[PDB]
Each structure stands twice: as structure tokens, then as C-alpha cells.
């Protein structure tokens, strides 16, 4: 049950054990996959209110693997959930890159991963 949760409001993680066996978390909000398998990236990126924007930049959020762009997300400054089901190998670096740090609000902003069990039984 390897699951981690990063809170950007306090820049601190929420882990199941003092040291997860599947990843090694960093204090800035990045991860390093230590175990091959299936994982579930998730999280919500709360943008600052659209009237607080001075640098009229698109609200583009991107999740990155080692060097491959995993997904590109953008909308008109609304609640932006991220992640998805992705097969990962040991050693892969998981980190976010944003279009402008002025857009990301600290409150209610979080993201993490969960080690995926196999889902054999289908209805």
C-alpha cells in the first residue's frame, strides 16, 4: 500500500510509512520511482483567481517523467486535477513543471502517487 501525498501549502509530504518502499520523496515535491509496476498519479492544482493575474500567461501544468512529457494540462484558470494511471519503472523521476509560479495557489493544492494493486476480478 505504497501511497504518498504532497501538500504544497506546507511543502511537506503525507506518507504511509516513515520511508516508502516504492519511492523516495524529496522536500520540494518530486519523487523517484524505486519499484517497477503500476502507479496512480493524482492531485489537484488550484489556480489563483483569474482577476489576480497580472502576467497574462496560460495556465499550463505539465507532469514530467525523466525526460518525456507525460501529459500537458491547461484551462482558463479553473480547478485542474492532474495524474492518471501510468506504468512506471524503477529510477523514473516524477516532477511537475508550471507555466508561471504566480498562478499556483498554496491552499488546497496537493499531489501524490499510490502503488496500484492488480485488479483481476472484472464485472
Amino acid at each position: 500500500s505504497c501511497m504518498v501525498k504532497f501538500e504544497l501549502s506546507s511543502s511537506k509530504w503525507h506518507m504511509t510509512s516513515p520511508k516508502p518502499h516504492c519511492v523516495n520523496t524529496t522536500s520540494d515535491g518530486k519523487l523517484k520511482i524505486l519499484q517497477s509496476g503500476t502507479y496512480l498519479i493524482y492531485g489537484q492544482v488550484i489556480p489563483v483567481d483569474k482577476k489576480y493575474i497580472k502576467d497574462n500567461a496560460p495556465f499550463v501544468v505539465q507532469i514530467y517523467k525523466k525526460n518525456d512529457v507525460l501529459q500537458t494540462l491547461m484551462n482558463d484558470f479553473q480547478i485542474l486535477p492532474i495524474g492518471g494511471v501510468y506504468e512506471l519503472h524503477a529510477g523514473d523521476n516524477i516532477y511537475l513543471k508550471f507555466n508561471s509560479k504566480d498562478h499556483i495557489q498554496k491552499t488546497n493544492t496537493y499531489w501524490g502517487i499510490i502503488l496500484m494493486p492488480d485488479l483481476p476480478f472484472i464485472s
Partner: peptide, 10 residues
């Protein structure tokens, strides 16, 4: 230019 990923124009 005002973007660090995808650029906005002014």
C-alpha cells in the same frame, strides 16, 4: 512573452 512552458503574448 509571459510563459515558462507555453507562451502568452502581449
Amino acid at each position: 512573452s509571459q510563459g515558462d512552458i507555453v507562451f502568452g503574448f502581449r
